[PDB]
Design a protein around this ligand. Structure first.
Ligand SMILES: CCCCCCCC/C=C/CCCCCCCC(=O)OC[C@H](O)CO
Ligand SMILES: CCCCCCCC/C=C/CCCCCCCC(=O)OC[C@H](O)CO
Ligand SMILES: CCCCCCCC/C=C/CCCCCCCC(=O)OC[C@H](O)CO
Ligand SMILES: CCCCCCCC/C=C\CCCCCCCC(=O)OC[C@H](O)CO
Ligand SMILES: CCCCCCCC/C=C\CCCCCCCC(=O)OC[C@H](O)CO
Ligand SMILES: [Ca+2]
Ligand SMILES: [Ca+2]
Ligand SMILES: [Ca+2]
Ligand SMILES: [Ca+2]
Ligand SMILES: [Ca+2]
Ligand SMILES: [Mn+2]
Ligand SMILES: [Mn+2]
Length: 374
């Protein structure tokens, strides 16, 4: 049984993962990257390969964190819950790709604020008059997110509004990151302590809806079974991430796309696509609050943990990772933050709110497509 039960446990993980059909790009990604066949396809194949792995790793992390206990479980979600964003950004930092990391962090927020928002409102609202989410955990978390993004943008808004200064921007970003990371710890105490019931119920509800859609009885993987998949999926992602990051300069050169565009629009898809599909499917079950909850939760991690931690990592390995986003990026994120929060606060969405949000994201991507590289 110890062999055949391990097989079923693997089946349970794959069947709980939305876009598992893209796993076919894992060997292709590995082949192309290792043999260094063609840069553009090496980018694309690994790009496609990490997407299902993120979901696989997420379900492994979640299954492990459940039996890990309160304190440790939260640390696992801080770590392996953000692994894709973490791994890719760390590898990118180790190759001096500061702009890529900066754009990917902000882009991840943009995608969660506008893109998945639009998709959820469209797919959930096309066959309904409206969808309500008043007085839900989604609105609560949304308020926190509004402050989180604003805080993260402060050093950027600072440099943008300036009338030597190089070392001070670095010092400000690093001091800011310490503060935000203190907040993140308190956010964990909020999440796992005083308001544990709020997040727990939202998590259980989301799992229940996902089990309904995925159509497989909830099976709790053993610590051993989940830890293998966890460390297994992680090393594969690392390989694919390394290949993907190693081709950035070439893809930038072969195509006409800037590092900013690739970082802001392309890269975030990697760690969000699986979660986005999840959010959409839940929204179609007329449970927008849960759908929004997933997207808002991921944004909180990027804003409160991943982004400031990356500047800390940069400090450790002597790469000048900063919160010094471009002026347009700064302005854009502020726009997205206002609107998303306004839309989430109005309490009722429709399919048109989704069309327009989606259109705006496209318009932003279109604008960033014209953003100058030199
Ligand atoms: C579900 C998984 C099923 C997987 C089924 C895969 C079957 C083929 C496997 C080949 C692995 C080795 C591939 C080797 C490819 C080498 C590429 C090549 O040789 O190109 C070099 C290039 O010419 C430099 O200039
Ligand atoms: C109420 C007003 C309070 C603010 C008043 C201004 C305070 C200025 C100092 C920053 C404190 C931030 C605490 C964390 C400081 C770490 C910053 C740091 O160490 O920077 C070194 C730099 O990284 C080397 O390159
Ligand atoms: C039964 C009640 C009556 C039926 C209700 C029908 C609902 C309408 C659905 C719209 C799908 C969304 C349309 C596709 C999304 C367009 C987004 C957009 O902005 O597209 C820009 C364009 O792609 C740039 O070239
Ligand atoms: C580190 C991640 C490895 C991912 C593996 C994906 C599947 C590769 C299949 C066969 C391994 C080939 C072993 C090495 C033998 C081929 C020689 C090789 O290294 O080719 C690369 C080329 O030299 C460039 O400089
Ligand atoms: C629930 C009632 C119906 C039951 C049957 C369900 C049928 C689902 C139909 C279409 C799902 C469309 C999902 C669209 C998700 C697209 C999101 C995406 O793939 O990625 C977004 C972005 O590009 C990454 O950052
Ligand atoms: Ca769970
Ligand atoms: Ca409960
Ligand atoms: Ca879950
Ligand atoms: Ca996430
Ligand atoms: Ca209202
Ligand atoms: Mn249902
Ligand atoms: Mn609305």
């Amino acid at each position: 049984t110890a062999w055949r039960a391990a097989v079923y446990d693997l089946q349970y993980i794959l069947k709980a993962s939305p876009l598992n059909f893209l796993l076919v790009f894992v060997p292709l990604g590995l082949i192309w990257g290792h043999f260094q066949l063609s840069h553009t396809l090496t980018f694309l194949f690994n790009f496609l390969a990490i997407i299902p792995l993120a979901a696989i790793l997420a379900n492994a992390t979640e299954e492990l964190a459940d039996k890990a206990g309160n304190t440790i479980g939260g640390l696992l979600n801080a770590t392996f819950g953000n692994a894709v964003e973490l791994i890719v950004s760390i590898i990118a930092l180790k190759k001096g790709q500061v702009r890529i990391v900066q754009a990917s962090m902000l882009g991840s927020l943009l995608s969660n604020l506008l893109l998945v928002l639009g998709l959820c409102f469209i797919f959930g609202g096309y066959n309904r008059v409206q969808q309500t989410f008043n007085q839900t955990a989604a609105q609560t978390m949304s308020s926190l997110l509004a402050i989180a993004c604003a805080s993260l943008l402060i050093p950027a808004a600072f440099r943008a509004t300036l009338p030597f200064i190089d070392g001070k921007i670095l010092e400000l970003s690093r001091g800011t990151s310490i503060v935000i990371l203190i907040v993140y710890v308190l956010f964990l105490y909020f999440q796992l302590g005083s308001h544990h019931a709020l997040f727990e119920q939202q998590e259980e509800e989301t799992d229940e809806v996902m089990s309904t859609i995925s159509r497989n009885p909830h099976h709790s993987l053993s610590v051993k079974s989940s830890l293998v998949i966890l460390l297994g999926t992680t090393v594969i992602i690392s390989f694919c991430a390394d290949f993907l990051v190693g081709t950035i300069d070439n893809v930038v050169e072969s195509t006409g796309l800037s590092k900013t565009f690739i970082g802001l629009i392309v890269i975030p898809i990697v760690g969000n696509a699986a979660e986005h599909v999840t959010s959409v499917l839940v929204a179609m079950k007329d449970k927008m609050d849960l759908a929004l909850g997933v997207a808002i939760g991921s944004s909180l991690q990027v804003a409160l943990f991943v982004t400031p931690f990356m500047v800390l990592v940069g400090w450790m390995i002597d790469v000048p990772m900063t919160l010094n986003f471009s002026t347009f990026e700064t302005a854009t994120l502020f726009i997205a933050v206002f609107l998303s929060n306004y839309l989430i606060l109005d309490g009722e969405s429709n399919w048109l709110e989704g069309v327009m949000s989606l259109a705006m994201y496209i318009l932003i991507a279109m604008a960033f497509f014209y953003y100058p590289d030199e």
